[PDB]
Structures are given as C-alpha cells and as structure tokens.
Design a protein around this ligand. Structure first.
Ligand SMILES: O=C(O)CCCC(=O)Nc1ccc(/C=C/c2ccccc2)cc1
Lengths: 219, 213
C-alpha cells in the first residue's frame, strides 16, 4: 500500500530549470529508507539521479551534481527534484522510487513515471481527421474506421471511442515527429452490421493545450 | 561507476518455455545484484534482490543465480503476462547502476495482417494537406514491409510507419503507414495503393482506391 507518484510540468524550455514533485502515501518519508530520483532517456538507458534519506542525507550522481538539487517537505510527505540549465539531452521519463538506504540497495516501490520534454517549440493543439473507407470500397464481415491526430505538441494525446457494440478492438499507434510536430492515429474495428447504422465518433484530448475534439465518422 | 552489461537486448520464446537473461558487471559486486521488470506502459516492479532472493509477491518461476561479475535471471514456465523488459542493477556502490535491459517477446502462431486503406478526409483537403493512411492490423511475426504506389509508381519519401507494442493478451503486432503529400500533388494522380509483404503469404496483400470513383 506504499505509493509514489510524480508530477510537474511536461514541457520545459532550454536553459531553464526542470521541477518535479513526488507525493508519497501509505508510508512516511521520515521513518526509514532512501527516496530516489531516476530517469530513463531515449534508448531505454536507465540513470539514477540522487536521493534524500529519511534522515535528510543527500547524494547525487556525479554526472549531475553540478546542476541538481533534491529537497523534501516532511509536512506534506513529499520530496522534490530541481535540475538546472536543461537542454534537449534532459528529455526523458522521470521516476521517483523508494529504496533501501544501503544494505541490499533495492528499489522496492516505484512511481509510474512522468514524461518531461525539453524544447523551445510552442504548445500546439492537434488537428483531428476522420478515417472512413472510400466510396467504391464495398467490404465484408466487419469494418475498420480511424482517426488521424496530426500536428500537435507536446505529447501526449488520448483517443477514446464510442460506437454501441462491446466487440470493438482498438489500436493506438505511437506518435512520430513529422518535422517539429507530432502525428499519431488510432483504429477501431466494428461489425459491418453496426456501421453506418450506429454512429461512431472518436474523442481526442490534448492536456498540454487543454483541448478536446470529437469527430463523427461518416460513410 | 560500475558498468552493467546485458549482452542480449532481444529475446523471443514460447509459452511454457524457460528463458535465461544474463547480466555482467565491470567489477566484482559480491552478489549485490537485483532484477526488475518494466512493463511496456513503464510500470516497474522488483523481482529478485541479492542474486536469488524473491521480492514479496513474485511468482516462484522467477529465480536468479551468479557470483563475482556474472549473474543470470531465469524465468521458467513462461507466461503471457511476462511480455516485458528485464533490467539488472548493482546494489553495492553509488551511483546505483542498471543494465540496458533485455526485451522479451512471447511467440505465437503466424498470422496475416488485416489491411485497410483510407483516403484523405473532406476536412483535411480543405486545409491544403492530404494524408493517405494504411492500417495493417493483428499480425505475427513483427517483421513486415509496406510499399506505397501512386499511379503505379513506388513512393519512398514522405511515409511514416508506427508499430504497436506486442499485444499483451494475444501476442499480435499492428502497424500504421501514412503517406503525406500536398493537396495539389494528391489531386494530380488517380490511384493510390498500399502493399503489405509478410511471411504469411507468397504474394503481397494489396488494397487501393481510385479518386475517379
Ligand atoms: O558509496 C557506497 O559504496 C555506499 C554508500 C551507502 C549507500 O548509500 N548505499 C546505497 C544507497 C542507495 C541505493 C539505491 C539503489 C536504488 C536502486 C534502484 C532504484 C532506486 C534506488 C543503493 C545503495
């Protein structure tokens, strides 16, 4: 029942500082253990950043000691990461974790990870386009429809579907960078006897821009 | 820093099988070695600490061995849930350091992709863009090739491909292919084809539409 979760901005400009919080519940950060910041860069290469012990002792990875600072607030049962002078190299998934303070050195509980992007690029909402079969494209047993989410920044985006039949297989394809901006897509497969009879619409949320659009799919 | 090396980054095995994943350290770490499971959503779980001791909750089909610099994780009676990346970590000195991980794929029966093509939308065309899209859904094995042809002529430039993670329940892969050209380029040609070449078939799977229809 120990739980950690990291929060903080998902987009930071080059040369500024990155700030994150880890909220701990079900255990007190003063009782025992070390409280760690880690990060995983593009290519899945995992890197320990530092800790604050339950007694307030602090240690840092030598590659980052010049730019890093970990603090705690025992009143809120939270610990914090500040990393200064960030560049694109600091784009990563950031993790908090509880570990043994010495002995076996095992990290026994981890947060889910939060994604931080370091770029000067502007926050842009997505364009959402319906994907329906062409007119002369007579089909068979079931029908695949989709949405194209193009030209947004930063990641991430959520695509949810509503149709009527719980025999809907959804696929969500990871986004790619198309010349500065992100593009992704999602598909849904429904029986041919439910569409175009029953309405199908995709919902695309983009929290960075706090936008939500719904495209109805038309034959 | 102690450098941790997992020489194998990719591994593919069948359900029930036994798999061994190896980890090596740049110096002697006296059995202070831990193993972790990272699921594709990024969730991380401790499996084994101090070479061979099970973390609370972990099934007994996970086990570990080793001494000195060489260590191994053994997963036997391999399960559908074990699709993950497996990382080692030395716990003897600061900074704590991790291996690059070994990705594990669960084998499955060969399956041919269900292919679909979509023309540019009404709305997109008004914007002056034109994206043709192709879904190749629910195939195995992962390796697959997609060829776009515009009026029969092959198109390599302006194509984006995106594979999903191995499906956690059925072990299939899916892929989207996206050809992006300008509205004017798009409107200069009649036929648009999407050709899937996969192990499951000797001849490609072809889907297309014609604008003059
Ligand atoms: O420098 C030394 O040799 C010993 C200093 C004592 C010490 O802090 N040991 C120690 C402290 C913390 C760890 C943490 C390991 C860890 C591993 C995975 C995730 C999060 C943390 C591992 C070892």
């Amino acid at each position: 029942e120990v739980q950690l979760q990291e929060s903080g901005p998902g987009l930071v400009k080059p040369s500024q500082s990155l700030s994150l919080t880890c909220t701990v519940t079900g255990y007190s950060i003063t009782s025992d253990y070390a409280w760690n910041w880690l990060r995983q860069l593009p290519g899945n290469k995992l890197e320990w950043m530092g800790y604050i012990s339950y007694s307030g002792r602090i240690r840092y990875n030598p590659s980052l000691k010049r730019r890093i600072s970990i603090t705690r607030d025992t009143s809120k049962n939270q610990f914090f990461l500040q990393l200064n002078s960030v560049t694109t190299e600091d784009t990563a998934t950031y993790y908090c974790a509880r570990s043994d303070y010495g002995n076996y050195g095992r990290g026994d509980y981890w947060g889910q990870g939060t994604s931080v992007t370091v770029s000067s690029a502007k926050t842009t909402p997505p364009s959402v386009y319906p994907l329906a079969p062409g007119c002369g494209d007579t089909t068979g047993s079931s029908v695949t429809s989709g949405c194209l989410v193009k030209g947004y920044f930063p990641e991430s985006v959520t695509v949810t579907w509503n149709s009527g039949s719980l025999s809907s297989s959804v696929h969500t394809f990871p986004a790619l960078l198309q010349s500065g901006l992100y593009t992704m897509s999602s598909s849904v497969t429904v029986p041919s006897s439910t569409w175009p009879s029953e309405t199908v619409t995709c919902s695309v949320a983009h929290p960075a821009s706090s936008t939500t659009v719904d495209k109805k799919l038309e034959p | 820093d102690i450098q941790m090396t997992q020489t194998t980054s990719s591994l593919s095995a069948s359900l029930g099988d036994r798999v061994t994943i190896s980890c090596r350290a740049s110096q002697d770490i006296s059995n202070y070695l831990n193993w972790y499971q990272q699921k594709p959503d990024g969730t991380v779980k401790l499996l084994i600490y101090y070479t061979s001791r099970l973390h609370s909750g972990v099934p007994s089909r996970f086990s570990g061995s080793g001494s000195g610099t060489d260590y191994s994780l053994t997963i036997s009676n391999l399960d559908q849930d074990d699709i993950a990346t497996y990382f080692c970590q030395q716990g003897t000195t600061l900074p704590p350091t991790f291996g690059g991980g070994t990705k594990l794929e669960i084998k499955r029966a060969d399956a041919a992709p269900t292919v679909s093509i979509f023309p540019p939308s009404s709305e997109q065309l008004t914007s002056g863009g034109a994206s043709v899209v192709c879904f190749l859904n629910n195939f195995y094995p992962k390796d697959i090739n997609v060829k776009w042809k515009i009026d029969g002529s092959e198109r390599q430039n302006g194509v984006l491909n995106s594979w999903t993670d191995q499906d956690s329940k059925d072990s299939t892969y899916s892929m989207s292919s996206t050809l992006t050209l300008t509205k004017d380029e798009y409107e200069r040609h009649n036929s648009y084809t999407c050709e899937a070449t996969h192990k499951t078939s000797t001849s490609p799977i072809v889907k297309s539409f014609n604008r003059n229809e």
